Design an enzyme around this catalytic site. Sequence first.
Site, short mmCIF file in Angstrom:
data_model
loop_
_atom_site.label_atom_id
_atom_site.label_comp_id
_atom_site.label_asym_id
_atom_site.label_seq_id
_atom_site.Cartn_x
_atom_site.Cartn_y
_atom_site.Cartn_z
N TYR A 62 -0.65 -39.89 -3.18
CA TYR A 62 -2.08 -39.30 -2.94
C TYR A 62 -1.77 -37.84 -2.71
O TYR A 62 -2.27 -37.18 -3.33
CB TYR A 62 -2.91 -39.93 -1.56
CG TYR A 62 -4.32 -39.21 -1.63
CD1 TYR A 62 -5.10 -39.65 -2.29
CD2 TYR A 62 -4.36 -38.51 -0.51
CE1 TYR A 62 -6.46 -39.34 -2.27
CE2 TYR A 62 -5.67 -37.91 -0.47
CZ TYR A 62 -6.93 -38.60 -1.27
OH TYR A 62 -8.20 -38.06 -0.89
N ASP A 75 -16.52 -27.46 11.12
CA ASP A 75 -17.06 -28.19 10.24
C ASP A 75 -16.52 -27.60 8.68
O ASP A 75 -16.09 -26.34 8.71
CB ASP A 75 -18.64 -28.01 10.01
CG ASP A 75 -19.45 -28.35 9.14
OD1 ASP A 75 -19.24 -29.78 8.75
OD2 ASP A 75 -20.07 -27.59 8.26
N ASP A 133 -4.03 -35.15 7.93
CA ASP A 133 -2.62 -35.27 8.40
C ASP A 133 -1.76 -34.24 8.36
O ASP A 133 -0.95 -33.89 9.23
CB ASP A 133 -2.01 -36.28 7.41
CG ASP A 133 -2.08 -36.07 5.86
OD1 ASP A 133 -1.10 -36.47 5.24
OD2 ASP A 133 -2.69 -34.94 5.56
N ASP A 186 -9.80 -32.89 0.62
CA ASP A 186 -9.17 -34.23 1.17
C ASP A 186 -10.29 -35.05 1.86
O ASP A 186 -9.42 -35.84 2.72
CB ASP A 186 -7.75 -33.82 1.96
CG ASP A 186 -6.95 -35.17 2.45
OD1 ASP A 186 -7.02 -36.03 1.73
OD2 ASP A 186 -6.64 -35.19 3.50
N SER A 187 -11.40 -34.93 1.64
CA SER A 187 -12.36 -35.69 2.39
C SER A 187 -12.33 -37.14 2.23
O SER A 187 -11.33 -37.86 1.73
CB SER A 187 -13.77 -35.26 1.62
OG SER A 187 -13.94 -35.49 0.30
N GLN A 210 -15.44 -40.05 14.10
CA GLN A 210 -14.79 -41.34 13.68
C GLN A 210 -14.21 -42.11 14.72
O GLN A 210 -13.42 -41.70 15.61
CB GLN A 210 -13.95 -40.89 12.42
CG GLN A 210 -12.77 -40.23 12.68
CD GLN A 210 -12.30 -39.28 11.57
OE1 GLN A 210 -12.15 -39.59 10.58
NE2 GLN A 210 -12.40 -38.03 11.74
N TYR A 225 -4.82 -48.02 -1.16
CA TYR A 225 -6.09 -47.60 -1.25
C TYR A 225 -6.83 -48.88 -1.82
O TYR A 225 -6.32 -49.74 -2.21
CB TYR A 225 -6.08 -46.44 -2.12
CG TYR A 225 -5.87 -45.15 -1.36
CD1 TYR A 225 -6.60 -45.17 -0.28
CD2 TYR A 225 -5.29 -44.19 -1.85
CE1 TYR A 225 -6.43 -43.52 0.57
CE2 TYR A 225 -4.80 -42.97 -1.19
CZ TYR A 225 -5.73 -42.85 0.08
OH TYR A 225 -5.49 -41.51 0.65
#
Lengths: 290, 285, 290, 285
Positions: free
Chosen positions: A66, A142, A91, A161-162, A36, A230
Amino acid sequence: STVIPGWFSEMSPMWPGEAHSLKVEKVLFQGKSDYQDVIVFQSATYGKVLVLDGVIQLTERDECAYQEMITHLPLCSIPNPKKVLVIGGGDGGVLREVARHASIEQIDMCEIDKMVVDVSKQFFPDVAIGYEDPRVNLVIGDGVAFLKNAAEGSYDAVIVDSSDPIGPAKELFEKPFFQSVARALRPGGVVCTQAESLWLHMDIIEDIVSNCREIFKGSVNYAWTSVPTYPSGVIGFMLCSTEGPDVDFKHPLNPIDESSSKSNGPLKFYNAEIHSAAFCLPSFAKKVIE
Amino acid sequence: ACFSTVIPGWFSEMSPMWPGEAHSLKVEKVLFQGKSDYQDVIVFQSATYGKVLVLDGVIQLTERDECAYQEMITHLPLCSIPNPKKVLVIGGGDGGVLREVARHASIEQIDMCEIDKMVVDVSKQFFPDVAIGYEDPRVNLVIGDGVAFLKNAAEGSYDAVIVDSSDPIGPAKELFEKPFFQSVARALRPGGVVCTQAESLWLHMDIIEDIVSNCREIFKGSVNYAWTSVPTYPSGVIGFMLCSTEGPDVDFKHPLNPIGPLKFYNAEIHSAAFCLPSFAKKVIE
Amino acid sequence: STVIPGWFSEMSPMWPGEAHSLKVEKVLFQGKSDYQDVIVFQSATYGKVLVLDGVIQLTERDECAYQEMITHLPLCSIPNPKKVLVIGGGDGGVLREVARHASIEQIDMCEIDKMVVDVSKQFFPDVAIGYEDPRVNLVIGDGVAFLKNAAEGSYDAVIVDSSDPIGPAKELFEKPFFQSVARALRPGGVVCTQAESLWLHMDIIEDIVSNCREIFKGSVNYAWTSVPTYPSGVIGFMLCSTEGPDVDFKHPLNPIDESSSKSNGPLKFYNAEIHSAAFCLPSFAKKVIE
Amino acid sequence: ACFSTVIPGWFSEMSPMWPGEAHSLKVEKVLFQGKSDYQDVIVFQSATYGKVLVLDGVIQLTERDECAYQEMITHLPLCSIPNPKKVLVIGGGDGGVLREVARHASIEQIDMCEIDKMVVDVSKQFFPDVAIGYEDPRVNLVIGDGVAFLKNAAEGSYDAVIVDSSDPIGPAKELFEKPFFQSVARALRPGGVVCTQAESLWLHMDIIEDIVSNCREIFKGSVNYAWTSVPTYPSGVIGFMLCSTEGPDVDFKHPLNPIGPLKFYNAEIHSAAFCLPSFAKKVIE
């Protein structure tokens, strides 16, 4: 038109015609990793900001909404979770939220992008603390594969937490994944996964409810919460339990009153009223999600 | 054309009331852009939200989410008290509050006090959709100073007062101070209620504390605070103060007088609004 | 990981394991359009940067090299060009470079992204001017199709100011697109396309060269030039002519000098010698590209 | 160390010799690190750029593109003069330049002056396809100070000197000053040539102006300039000073003595390197 300078604007086709902006104070780091286009910058009024592939991944000012949410909603709905799996801890704060629970034996913080984990540990303080917990078991790799090659009924809870179902992470929102999730969950175990926003993804969310329903014998539920930084400001979650003991997601069994952490740290955006209120959905969606 | 903004061809709502952040919508076409004796008015066509209403640069409403705030500010209070008949509304809007207030077939006279005569035109003309709120019998429209009509008005003649005011960006700060919440305490009947827009827990827990405090000194019956999701408002949420006068005890937390169909409001939702988050629940003890 | 914060690092799979970086002074514009990711920032030592989908597009400090070479290698190669076409807004500097040619009657750029033409021209001085010239007709919108609607033999030259062959622009390197350039050009018409770097894409460059050796029947030539802010430090170009009067891309018939555009500013990078030097390829590539 | 990095686990090449920018390479594994009596000798494995030699945090060479610098720096001079027999090379830690010089059969002796045996060693243990150059019959390796080597050299005893330095920032700054050049001049036979590494045109048109000024003062034959593409050097390019002392003519723009084959340099490329960009052709007409 002329654009005033100094601003960062979150824009996606997943939420067209609208955008949330933030005055950038100082650039702290941007790079396109293998997975990313990551970014960490100091905002003007929201503190440090983590951005992944464009989408604001989190903010310091409201991360508590969140984090405390995606974590405590399911963790407080079941008695003494001991082995918990965390997928996508971009995080470590979600991990920090977990450590509040004394019964926790070990957490398998399973993240895939190392540029993030690294950049998070550096700039973010109270966020990098999580990875440090002894009970934590970090593993760069993964996630979907991690859950396939996962022992059966070994986990008490699964927290995804995708991000969003945009590219190869769309699996985490499909039926092959939910089945891979349940396999790892012991009977009565629970899974919590963010499920986009009610004001913007009824269709998507709806498919997710159908999917989870066709996979979990327990009680699949959808609870939503408030988080300003968000998209639209109302990201939701899917709460599912596997065949086994009943799970009342609407009435946490061991809700962190506040003292149920006391010397650990104060809850910022969670309590027993929020846990139940969280679920009360608006009419337009109430009928659909049911 | 588009001058002020942080994105090409897009409107960006920004103000010192929520600096450092901004919300933007893709401008399809600017329909109306005029100025009254009160403020700057704009009605731009949204590419994904519908019609839009902006006052002094602050999005007042859009078509896509006009249901939330409206089915929130009018029914939370209007569903509390049993059999309301006299209602006072103070604010502009697009006729939404009316579309919803009139839902309470129980009410009789609906005095609405909109001071900015231009906000009326635009709502009536540009928003024929919910502008019907006006075209209703039970409604008595008044063009004048909100704080006025009220102050100079009978006593105990109202069951409810709804302050669909704008943010305290100045002259409207008066609708947040004690003298106003007193004019409301008189104008209301015993056990009567108030429902006013009250900032965002995320942005002004302090101003919200001064409001809760003021209200708490004026109302000896019941004082409460509720917040609701509204995507188009800064922070994604908007707060409400729910207060009741002297007399019958009211329970705002639970609907005593419950009820196209509603889109956002529903028994469950009603009780949700009174479940403030921790950091917020603390201060507003 | 004690990374010095405050730097933008250009990354892409197009060049694995390496990266350019700039100590950012301040953010000016950072958002995202329907087509690509955009960024306009004030760098510490390169003035202003412009990035598309995470790829440095230009620097005010060294944009002269690219824009000047991509424009004059073809034009100067042909006498009195009158009607020329340019694809890929970029910033307008290239557009400005074409303006230096007095014989030009009409200039046309096709930036499929109005956000770029808007944000860029807005934050850049000696760059917006390109859109300013009276001879320009900014036709915003897909250009691959633009040539499809173009009259046969109606252009003297085509300049493809494209991006990396990763985004949707990957088509701009395909045979079909080149066939339209050939038919859109007068007999003897020239094409000049951004053609990657010899240090990083020899294989690709061979296919690109192969395709022009078929579509275009005139002379085919691969030229290269130093461009600091592009990966590897250099950049390539395809100079192709269609059957008709012969074109010697190597020996410019009329290279720009300075007095030719006195009021436009002297030439900062281009000159007749550097023109011919551009077609001299290093051995490793020489053999392959013949 | 892992300090100079704008990307965790990567090596970032930053220096005041080119502030505001930085080249970074993904590190696969560190192979060596040490603090000789002179400087830091970093050596790691770059994910996709081969074994990289790093000195004082500055890319000294990478297996992937050593050929460019090495080919140009060596053949620029040795191909402009007929039958070179004796040649001196200064600071060639790597062997690559040696290998390149040795390619010239006419050569009877190659002199080498590296001021740090360590590097020659690190190079020997990690850079085979170059360090090979140290093992030639004509190579006379010496470990010592170059400005001293030249100062002690016999007058007019060299056909060519190769000055492979770093940057005019520290002690190596003396190699860009007149004293040293005059020394290099005295050492060259008449009509002899020197080739000095002369930084980037995009970064030091001033430092490169002083150099051109001194060489033009010390040398009476010819004093040109050449720049070549070397991806891994700041700005992707780097230059060379080509000078020839009083004596036979020397035309560097056209290799009078044109040469596993070389992977970069050729006749066309040789002359191409003398075509400077306008902005540069001005400052150094």
